[model samples]
Target chain A: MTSERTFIAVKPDGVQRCLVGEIIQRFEKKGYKLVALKMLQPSAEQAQQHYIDLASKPFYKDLVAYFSSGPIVGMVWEGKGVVKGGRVLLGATNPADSLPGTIRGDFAVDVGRNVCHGSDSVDSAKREIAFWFKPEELVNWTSHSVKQVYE
Target chain B: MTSERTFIAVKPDGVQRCLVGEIIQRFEKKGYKLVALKMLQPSAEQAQQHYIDLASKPFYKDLVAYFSSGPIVGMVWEGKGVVKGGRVLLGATNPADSLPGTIRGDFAVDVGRNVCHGSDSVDSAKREIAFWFKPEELVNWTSHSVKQVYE
Candidate 1:
């Protein structure tokens, strides 16, 4: 299994609602390695390019508006196949269409205010990881807990 | 300040959906004390009686059925005004009506499957605390983190 990295963010709605710990706990408990994390607000330019794929969609303005409304908890996680594994945890794009075991499935109700975002592919993961984090910001830790957790 | 106890449960849907840690982290992060915790399935009789006050209501049957469907993470939380404070953490009974910053508001989408439950009153808290926990099951701990977390 190849170890991969992915970008994960607790969106504005998630931060405003105080789910920072709750959201982080999910990845922690799942034994994913947290390489980097920070509380940040995306610049309008960053937000525009991040979701630019949906720029032509009707909810585009709402997406940018909601995302920029507050501080978001940004994170980079590393683990075996994490790019794909993380997306599985995130569930579908529309939270209402997500399943019970997924983050969106269990908690989210609307797309505009969905509680989380994850990098969808390895390429996207790399792009997002670099976009949101600097090389030195990543933490390195080794302990019995991490070994026990990942096994 | 009076330290009161309230009953909270991470519902079966929450457990099956892998939200046990996520649910627990909410209380822990909110500066509450986890007085007692256990995992158990409520018998049909227990479920019905637990909601007996609602037995005459239209949604009573559905309520019982939903609760008894699987194992629940039962807990007692102790803190100042915990009966009311816990509810604020849990959000509205129906996720749709909950605000964005609450537990339900951030993650839950359905009323019937709202991921968790909290006692509505001190009486309910007392009743539930007794019903769900043995005296010895509660753990007490002192941490430096407490002062930083609560007023």
Candidate 2:
């Protein structure tokens, strides 16, 4: 089944390491459509609220600190089964345990410095989409070549 | 000191496996300049000549076969001391033994199918630049933001 939206962010570590292109390329090459992207630093309030679900946890401070440390590449990717498909490609949240073929598995080294973030569920996807993007900012378009690949 | 132009190709396996973007991103993120890029298949004669130095080696047959099997993303990257800098980012030629942070080490599984390549020396760089690109194909621009990261 095709889904039209998901929230994807290249974390501060990824930006510091110049992985914006590498991270974007992964989704693009996989036939997922890029609907919008921009480089921006998250405000402290945004970072805290973005990960607020985990706020009571011990890692929340580290998470917020790391996220707000630099500019993150935020994006919306759209395509068939992209939520599940994208997570499979992202590997585990902890890069150390991620498999070699997946993005976090390959490029990241530390849990504290994991390279990217993706919405965990369809509901989370919706919340994240709104949190990171204004409605008018998301572009709607399709790739003729990608349609051939996915079809 | 910057001295030459080198040819690097992300092989068909890399392209088919959706690693081209990641491969290019690594080079770009490393502060290397993208001078030229093209998506094309090399002629059998060109492939043979390009790897002539390896012609007498035992792996030569397989090398030619692999090189010609699919479309390759050919690129020329320029930078101060790029021959060495690119190699460091690429890791070893064999992915199995490549380091965790390097491109090949992180994404590839086999030597025959290593995701990317870099020219070994300045002389070879000249030969490769001429082989895959004409004078006008090289892009002439620099990243303004790079000054902040690379001296």
Q: Which candidate has the highest lDDT of all?
A: 2
TM-score of chain B of 2: 0.91
For model 2, the local distance difference test gives: 0.77
Computed on alpha carbons, the lDDT of every model, listed in order, comes to 0.75, 0.77
Clashing pairs in 2: none
Candidate 1: Cα lDDT at A39: 55
Q: For residues A1-151, what per-residue lDDT tens digits would candidate 2 score against the true structure?
A: 4655788988876765667677778787777766655556687899988988998998898788878876666788887767788888898888877899899898898888888998888888889998988886675544555657665
Candidate 1 backbone collisions, by pair: A17-B101, A107-B107
User: What are the models' TM-scores?
Assistant: 0.51, 0.54
Which stretches of model 2 miss by more than 4 angstroms? B1-27, B30-151
CAPRI-style docking class of model 1 based on DockQ: incorrect
For model 1, chain A alone compared with the true chain A gives a TM-score of 0.89
In each prediction, how many residue pairs overlap at the backbone (N, C-alpha, C within less than 3 A)? 2, 0
Which segments of candidate 1 are over 4 A away from where they belong? A146-151, B1-151
Error of 2 at B81 (Å): 16
